[PDB]
Amino acid sequence: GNITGLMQLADYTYNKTRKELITAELLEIIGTMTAMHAGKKVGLKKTEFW
Amino acid sequence: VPSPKYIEIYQSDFSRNAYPLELLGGSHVDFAKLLYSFADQVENKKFEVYVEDFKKLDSIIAEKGPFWAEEKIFQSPTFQGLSEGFKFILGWIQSEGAIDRLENVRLAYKELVNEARKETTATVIVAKEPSGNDLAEI
Amino acid sequence: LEAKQKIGFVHGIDGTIATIAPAASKVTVPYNTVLEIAVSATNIANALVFNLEKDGSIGVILLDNISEVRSGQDVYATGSLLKIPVGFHMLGKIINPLGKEIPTGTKLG
């Protein structure tokens, strides 16, 4: 019974940490893609206004 | 109101042309190079015209306040003293919202003109009031 | 005699860092070199080049007198790397990484 009580917490924290590691890697990639979007410039948009 | 001679240059491509100088910046390099195109082609190298317009524009700005963006550049009694091409580019700048970048345009157009005429300028500040003896030394 | 060379004016400042706007086009700044920012007629804020850009702008690391920095201040250039005084005369001292001594109570490297 005790070992099971430990096993659920171990499985729980394993999956908690698994999911948080996934989320973190995503936000790293999105941070980089976003920073590059800031690095890229805007164009001109030349057209007739009159 | 805008003449077709200006629209031919505007709708066409001009940034890829050969200039007196390669110009650093973002979009405002075009705000200046387009002025150079006007002054070179249709006005026949009467550069100082646009350089006068900037001066004129300064006097206009103070009288109109800071929110002169919202008003259209062509229809206005204040702007009547300006050139049609200067007005054209201010309309384009108004479209792009870059009207806060104007000083970075005159500071560039003057470089193009100063290298075409080959007239590098120099700025001195002497006192609350100039002194001739110092001037001769300077 | 000694005329300082200027390269641009301060465009933006974000806390410890800054962005320069170059004055002229033919002017060229090196990389990793120290720049100076005329925060006043008297004092100078040292700095360092960390980026260069297609726009000619310069990403700058500030190191001294950051609070006295504004936008539009004249920016000068030494054209030399960051250096500090070195020698046995420095032993027995606490020292700012710019070489400035921190009070208590020739050569360059």
Structure tokens at B122: 């120099």
**One-letter amino acid of B18:** A
Query: Residue holding tokens 């405002």?
Result: B28
By residue count, chain A amounts to: 50
Q: Of the candidates B1, B74, B92, which has its C-beta nearest A46's C-beta?
A: B92
Tokens of A43: 């164009």
Query: For residue B5, is it left (φ>0), alpha (ψ between -120 and 50) or beta?
Result: alpha
Cβ-Cβ contacts under 8 Å for B132 (sequence gap 6 or more): none
Distance CA B130, CA C12 (A): 35
**Structure token digits, residue A42:** 């805007």
Of A41, A42, A49, the CB nearest to B95: A49
Give dist(CA A32, CA C11) in Å, integer.
25
Q: Residue B28: which residues within 8 A CB-CB, separation 6 or more?
A: B98, B101, B104, B105, B108
β-strand partners of C10: C20
- How was this structure determined? It was done by cryo-EM
- This structure's resolution (Å) is 3.0
The three-class DSSP label of residue B74 is coil
DSSP string over B23-69 = --SSSHHHHHHHHHHHHHHTS-S-THHHHHHHHHHHHHHHHH-S--S
Full domain range(s) for residue C20: 1-82
Q: Look-up: residue for tokens 């259209």?
A: B72
Give the dihedral of Cα atoms C12, C14, C15, C20; nearest 10 deg: -40
Tokens of B80: 């009547």
Of C21, C28, C26, C32, nearest to C57 (Cα)?
A: C21
Tokens of C18: 């800054």
**Which residues in chain B touch residue C24, judged by CB atoms under 8 angstroms apart?**
111
DSSP helix/strand/coil, B116: helix
Tokens 């005369």 sit on residue = C89
Find chain B residues with C-beta within 8 A of C21's C-beta. Answer: 104
Phi and psi at residue B134, in whole multiples of 5°?
-60, -40
Rounded distance between C-alpha atoms, residue B84 and residue C44, angstroms: 45
Rounded Cα distance, A16 and A11, in Å? 9
- Cβ of residue A38 closer than 8 Å to a chain B Cβ: no
